[PDB]
Design a protein around this ligand. Structure first.
Ligand SMILES: [Mg+2]
Ligand SMILES: [Zn+2]
Ligand SMILES: [Zn+2]
Lengths: 88, 49, 45, 102, 49, 214, 30, 119, 48, 48
DNA sequence: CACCAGGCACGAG
RNA sequence: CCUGGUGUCUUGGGUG
DNA sequence: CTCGTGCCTGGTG
């Protein structure tokens, strides 16, 4: 398993919008069965270690093959500080 | 009906103009990802040679 | 269990994973998650 | 496509069921038989597709002992052998059976 | 990394030997390197990125 | 006798041509069709035979007298290279091009298909027709655990137990011979019919597990 | 403790927190 | 029409007869971007659904094929595939419906188009 | 420091001699013979 | 040794072999096919 | 990664 | 109750 | 109850 936390996930394997996420935070839980219980390997997608924000939208649908298809849009506010580049 | 569709999808996604097995000696970069950073960027990318 | 929201008729229904991703009213295959039960705060800065 | 166990020609099963063998039906009687006799006389597993063009002045037709038949597709090694009763009937009719399986 | 710590400082490309210089660390806020306005000539650098 | 059919200098030559790998039978059929169509006309394809071997991939041997006949037989063929890559075969190398070439009761063979692919089975009996044979092997069953099989998702190998399947949930035929799930098991060994083309007999190297078990 | 308003984690003494439960925010007696 | 006709020839001798299996290509028909799910239902596809579900905004093409047999003793539309459709074009779904229905389909009026949607 | 203690004396490289590997030396420094190109045989773990 | 040709994993479960591994497998297959020619009938050109 | 042959499950006489 | 694992190759645009 | 046929999968280049 990943070194991040897993308490921010609901019972459907997805995170609800409105919860603040930080670096190394699981947002989409996914497992893969191991071919020959614990016979499963983790295949989740955590957040970037240099990105902290708040989950805004979660889309869940089906692709062309028929399996599940999830998308998580995280929003954040960037405030100009020392180091930002501007141009006339 | 899979050959033509697969070839079109490959040539439009990867940009390699030609067959899949003949990636060498082919013009790459015909199809590019549309830059959606601002309106001016998209307007300049739509008129680029 | 988990509240959902349809993308067309905007119907609030709940599915238990095993149920397919579909709407129980208009049949739209595009749904979204609902707002969490936790309180969202801000520093107003 | 099946291969004859006696002559060695290569023909589909429907050909051996309708008209029989063009070089062995005189003693095998594959035309007036069922599917079991055709399966026991013709094998579906063969190796060595030979296109016999000449039926006399060809050395390939003489080495394969098919220099007295009809042109067509023949097999070098035909898997399986003829049953005991069929071999006995062929010997009683006056035709010696030679295994082509190697 | 505390104060009075000699650390090496460089900037690509490194043309002459003056591109790698040993400087003393001073803990400062924000996330930008604070340099003196006199070593900008050998470094051939500016503050535009 | 076969020794009286040896080739001499009077027999026509045999030329070997390189064809596309996987289209040798198609080339042979096309040459046969051309020879049958040119038979009786004013321009006959002066060829005698055309064949190929499975062990000689990408090679077609055509028997004729001159090279013009071979060039005419290979004219218009899409499965033959356009280059002049044809060679001559000596008279002493004529019978070797027409060489045809076991399975005994009690020998150990290996399966090349099905769920038991790669296991060392024992040949018990062979059918009267001579196509399929009976193989005794170590079963790979689950005793009906996830029932409401492929070679990649197969369980471990183990001897069939006549008592565990009853507790987990069976037709007793003979002493130790039980028909379970449509399969016959004698003394814990599964007896199954397998085709001849799906088994190997030559070059069988037993592993360490087979030496430790058998 | 990683706060919700800013994007940073801070160290805080134990006597400066209030944990939630089934009724309000319970201090160290939780 | 560059390569419209395909002609074959196979002399049969067992009474020789020439049997030519000619195949000619006809008119090309284009349809609207139709989306078909795994259940078999076909509906109207839109660029928003293609961008959300990572679909290909394309349209099927049909070609008329006529088969003829030439025996000398001497009809239905076939789907050839799909072609991608450019946005805001004459074969797109955003050209009609004026501008009132453009807001209901989650399409910005400032989007001039001129690009394809692949996956 | 990161390496475990060993009784072999620690030295430095002073000369790099180049050359070809003889078949006898190759067979001597070898530990196993490779004959079967199949990476996986039974497809049930445990390398063959 | 396998340290020179490491095995990378594509989509977690399925892993991909290095090009050197496939080259060595093809070389071993060719060497095995070579040994299967000096025992049976070989018409010179097939061996070459 | 793409083509070919074999095994499996469904439909009809 | 320690120990700890997500990758090889390209294509197009930018930074100094 | 048994044979014909479409679909899925492993071998091979
Ligand atoms: Mg600068
Ligand atoms: Zn709805
Ligand atoms: Zn015959």
């Amino acid at each position: 398993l990943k070194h991040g936390t897993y308490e921010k996930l609901d019972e459907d394997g997805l995170i609800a919008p409105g919860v603040r996420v930080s670096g190394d935070d699981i947002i989409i839980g996914k497992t893969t069965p191991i071919p020959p219980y614990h016979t499963k390997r983790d295949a989740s997608t955590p957040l970037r270690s240099t990105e902290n924000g708040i989950v805004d939208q979660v889309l869940l649908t089906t692709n062309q093959e028929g399996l599940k298809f999830v998308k998580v849009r995280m929003r954040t506010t960037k405030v100009p500080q020392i180091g930002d580049k501007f141009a006339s | 009906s899979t050959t033509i569709t697969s070839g079109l999808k490959y040539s439009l996604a990867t940009g390699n103009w030609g067959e899949q097995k003949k990636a060498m000696s082919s013009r790459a970069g015909v199809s590019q990802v549309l830059n959606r950073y601002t309106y001016s960027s998209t307007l300049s990318h739509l008129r680029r040679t | 269990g988990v509240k959902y929201t349809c993308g067309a008729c905007a119907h609030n229904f709940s599915l238990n994973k095993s149920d397919p991703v579909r709407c129980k009213e208009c049949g739209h295959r595009v749904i979204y998650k609902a707002r969490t039960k936790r309180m969202i705060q801000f520093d107003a800065r | 496509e099946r291969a004859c166990m006696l002559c060695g020609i290569v023909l589909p099963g429907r050909v051996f069921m309708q008209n029989g063998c063009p070089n062995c039906d005189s003693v095998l009687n594959l035309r007036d038989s069922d599917q079991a006799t055709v399966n026991e006389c013709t094998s579906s597993s063969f190796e060595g597709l030979v296109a016999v063009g000449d039926n006399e002045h060809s050395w390939v037709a003489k080495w394969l002992r098919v220099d007295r038949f009809q042109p067509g597709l023949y097999a070098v090694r035909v898997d399986g052998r003829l049953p005991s009763d069929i071999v006995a009937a062929l010997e009683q009719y006056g035709v010696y059976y030679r295994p082509r399986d190697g | 990394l505390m104060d009075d710590d000699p650390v090496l400082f460089n900037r690509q490309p490194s043309l002459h030997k003056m591109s790698m210089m040993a400087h003393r660390v001073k803990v400062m806020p924000y996330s930008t390197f604070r340099l003196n306005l006199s070593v900008t000539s050998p470094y051939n650098a500016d503050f535009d990125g | 006798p076969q020794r009286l059919l040896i080739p001499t200098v009077d027999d026509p030559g045999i030329w070997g041509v390189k064809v596309r790998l996987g289209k040798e039978k198609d080339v042979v059929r096309q040459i046969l069709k051309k020879k049958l169509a040119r038979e009786g006309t004013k321009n006959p394809l002066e060829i005698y035979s055309a064949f190929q071997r499975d062990s000689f991939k990408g090679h077609v041997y055509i028997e004729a007298r001159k090279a013009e006949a071979i060039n005419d037989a290979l004219k218009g063929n899409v499965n033959v290279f356009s280059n002049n890559s044809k060679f001559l075969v000596g008279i002493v190398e004529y019978k070797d091009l027409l060489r045809p070439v076991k399975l005994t009761r009690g020998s150990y063979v290996r399966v090349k298909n099905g769920k038991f692919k790669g296991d060392l089975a024992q040949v018990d009996e062979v059918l009267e027709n001579g196509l399929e044979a009976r193989l005794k092997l170590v079963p790979r069953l689950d005793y009906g655990k996830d029932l409401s099989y492929t070679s990649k998702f197969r369980p471990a190998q183990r001897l069939f137990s006549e008592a565990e399947a009853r507790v987990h949930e069976i037709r007793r035929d003979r002493d130790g011979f039980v028909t379970y799930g449509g399969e016959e098991y004698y003394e814990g060994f599964l007896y199954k019919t397998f085709r001849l083309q799906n088994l190997i007999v030559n070059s069988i190297n037993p592993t360490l597990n087979e030496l430790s078990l058998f | 403790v990683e706060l919700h308003n800013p994007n940073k984690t801070i160290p805080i003494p134990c006597s400066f927190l209030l944990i939630e439960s089934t009724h309000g925010w319970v201090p160290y007696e939780d | 029409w560059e390569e419209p006709r395909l002609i074959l020839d196979q002399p049969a001798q067992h009474d020789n007869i020439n049997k030519r299996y000619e195949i000619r290509f006809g008119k090309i028909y284009l349809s609207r971007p139709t989306m078909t799910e795994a259940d078999g239902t076909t509906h109207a596809m839109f660029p928003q659904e293609a961008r959300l579900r990572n679909l290909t905004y394309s349209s099927p093409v049909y070609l008329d094929m006529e088969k003829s047999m030439f025996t000398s003793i001497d009809g239905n539309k076939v789907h050839i595939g799909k072609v991608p459709i450019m946005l805001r074009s004459k074969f797109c779904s955003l050209r009609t419906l004026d501008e009132v229905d453009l807001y209901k389909m989650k399409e910005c009026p400032y989007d001039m188009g001129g690009y394809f949607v692949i996956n | 420091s990161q390496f475990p203690y060993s009784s072999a004396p620690l030295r430095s490289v002073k000369e790099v001699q180049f050359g070809l590997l003889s078949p006898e030396e190759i067979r001597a420094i070898s530990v196993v013979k490779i004959e079967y190109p199949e990476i996986m045989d039974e497809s049930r773990q445990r390398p063959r | 040794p396998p340290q020179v040709r490491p095995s990378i994993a594509m989509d977690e479960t399925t892993q991909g072999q290095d090009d050197l591994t496939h080259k060595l497998s093809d070389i071993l297959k060719a060497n095995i096919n070579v040994q299967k020619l000096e025992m049976d009938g070989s018409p010179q050109h097939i061996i070459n």
